[PDB]
Amino acid sequence: YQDLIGNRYLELKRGDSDQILPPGSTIPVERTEPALDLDALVGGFRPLFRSLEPEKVNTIATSLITIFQGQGGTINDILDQTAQLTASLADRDQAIGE
Amino acid sequence: GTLLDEAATAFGGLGPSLQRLVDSTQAIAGDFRANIDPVNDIIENSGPIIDS
Amino acid sequence: NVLSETVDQTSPHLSAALDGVARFSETIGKRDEDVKKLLASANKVATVLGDR
Amino acid sequence: SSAYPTIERTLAGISGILTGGGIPNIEVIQTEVFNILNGRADQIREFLNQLDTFTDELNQQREEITRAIDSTNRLLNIVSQRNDTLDRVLTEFPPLI
Amino acid sequence: TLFETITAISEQVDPIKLNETLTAAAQALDGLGDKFGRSIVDGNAILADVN
Amino acid sequence: ATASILNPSLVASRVIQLSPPYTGGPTLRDGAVLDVDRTQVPIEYDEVRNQVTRLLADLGPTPEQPKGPFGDIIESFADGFAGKGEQLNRTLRGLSDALTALNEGRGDFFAVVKSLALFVNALHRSDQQFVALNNDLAQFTNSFTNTDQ
Numbered sequence: 001y002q003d004l005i006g007n008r009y010l011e012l013k014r015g016d017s018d019q020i021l022p023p024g025s026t027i028p029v030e031r032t033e034p035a036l037d038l039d040a041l042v043g044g045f046r047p048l049f050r051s052l053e054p055e056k057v058n059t060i061a062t063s064l065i066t067i068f069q070g071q072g073g074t075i076n077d078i079l080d081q082t083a084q085l086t087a088s089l090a091d092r093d094q095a096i097g098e
Numbered sequence: 099g100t101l102l103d104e105a106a107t108a109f110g111g112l113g114p115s116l117q118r119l120v121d122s123t124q125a126i127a128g129d130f131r132a133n134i135d136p137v138n139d140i141i142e143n144s145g146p147i148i149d150s
Numbered sequence: 151n152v153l154s155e156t157v158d159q160t161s162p163h164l165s166a167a168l169d170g171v172a173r174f175s176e177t178i179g180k181r182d183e184d185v186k187k188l189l190a191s192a193n194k195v196a197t198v199l200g201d202r
Numbered sequence: 203s204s205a206y207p208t209i210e211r212t213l214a215g216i217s218g219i220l221t222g223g224g225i226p227n228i229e230v231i232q233t234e235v236f237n238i239l240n241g242r243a244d245q246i247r248e249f250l251n252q253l254d255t256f257t258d259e260l261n262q263q264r265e266e267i268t269r270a271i272d273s274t275n276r277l278l279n280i281v282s283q284r285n286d287t288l289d290r291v292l293t294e295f296p297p298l299i
Numbered sequence: 300t301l302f303e304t305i306t307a308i309s310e311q312v313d314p315i316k317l318n319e320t321l322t323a324a325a326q327a328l329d330g331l332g333d334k335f336g337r338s339i340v341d342g343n344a345i346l347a348d349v350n
Numbered sequence: 351a352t353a354s355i356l357n358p359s360l361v362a363s364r365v366i367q368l369s370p371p372y373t374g375g376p377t378l379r380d381g382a383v384l385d386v387d388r389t390q391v392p393i394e395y396d397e398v399r400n401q402v403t404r405l406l407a408d409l410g411p412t413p414e415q416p417k418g419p420f421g422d423i424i425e426s427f428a429d430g431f432a433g434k435g436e437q438l439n440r441t442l443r444g445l446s447d448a449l450t451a452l453n454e455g456r457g458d459f460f461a462v463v464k465s466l467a468l469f470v471n472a473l474h475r476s477d478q479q480f481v482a483l484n485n486d487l488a489q490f491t492n493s494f495t496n497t498d499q
Binding site for chain 5: 206207208209211212215216218219221222223224225227228230231233234235236237238239240242245246248249252253255256259
């Protein structure tokens, strides 16, 4: 972009290789990129803004507050007990298979 | 960046896998609640015969 | 904030739980066909027992 | 020497995130989360408490579970190595009975 | 400064990994989000009966 | 029809658009009255400014929480799952495989549960009679194996 009115320009980057490109050669599409395409940027916000509906956000927020308030110790106990039980069960893998 | 890398590692191609996980979980839980009465009967009455 | 503190509190106890759950789940996961055939045969035998 | 990102570059980065980042999925996820949490917050909390109690009770019986597994393994091994006797019984005893 | 901060975040977003993560998460519960909550309620009843 | 006021661009003449296009049926007659329920108003720039300011103040950094809610949650999720991606992936794959295996045989398993429930409910009342049966059988067999031959 030259500005926000609609003026463009072409920008060249040297690269790293020292092999001189002979005059008249064509740069392939593999290393050329377009400009902003503001319409695509604006249209990409449609799902993001559609996913911010206040009803769903508020319901999820209140539900998470209700579920996970003061439950750190409970979840820690669940994790410890299930780890111990599952380790003891998995120590008998050959026995279970037999 | 680190969180996105970890999430990509954990959720790389588990679309159908997690779909099957959730579907199986819900089906098993529903059928278990449907058949909870036989489960309770087994739990409460298996002890007598086995201990006998 | 609640999610942040829940993750901060339950993080140290998560790796062992994940490892144990993975191992025990794989114990049945690597024998799916055997487990299903066992369940079918047990269905037949238990039906015979219950009907009599 | 350096240069600030232009407005075009910033908007191009945001557009790349929006278009290549799978944004249209997010809403769906949120919707499903809503269906999980629609009027069931207290039920999920009490389920967490009950799962804690159930897992504690099961973990307290891990030694008995392992011993039962070992005992069943031994009995089933003996029965499997006498499966031939089992077949010979089931082929000829039912007619006699 | 605002553009620099947004660019610094955007360089860290890395949209490919975000795309695959979000695709997996959306396919995880695409058609069953009420089913999972009903299953949690059913498991709550089952635990209340079993404990 | 809904008469919605539209602002086409940053600096433009606002218009009134009858939003639903006509596809048949009854039509809007002359002298009709449209109430507030079936009209729309643009968003206005000051509402945008107020909402942006409100969200930035409410959900932004505070002296109590310097990094803010989103900063704290991303920090906790990055620290709380650093190195657990492979473990979580393996756990999820194993859980999915095991639960799918159980679900495919779910009907047979619950048929087993029902049949064993019938069996145990019909046999549980005679536990002492079973002990008596075993003891009497042992005695009856002892009645014929006092010697070797």
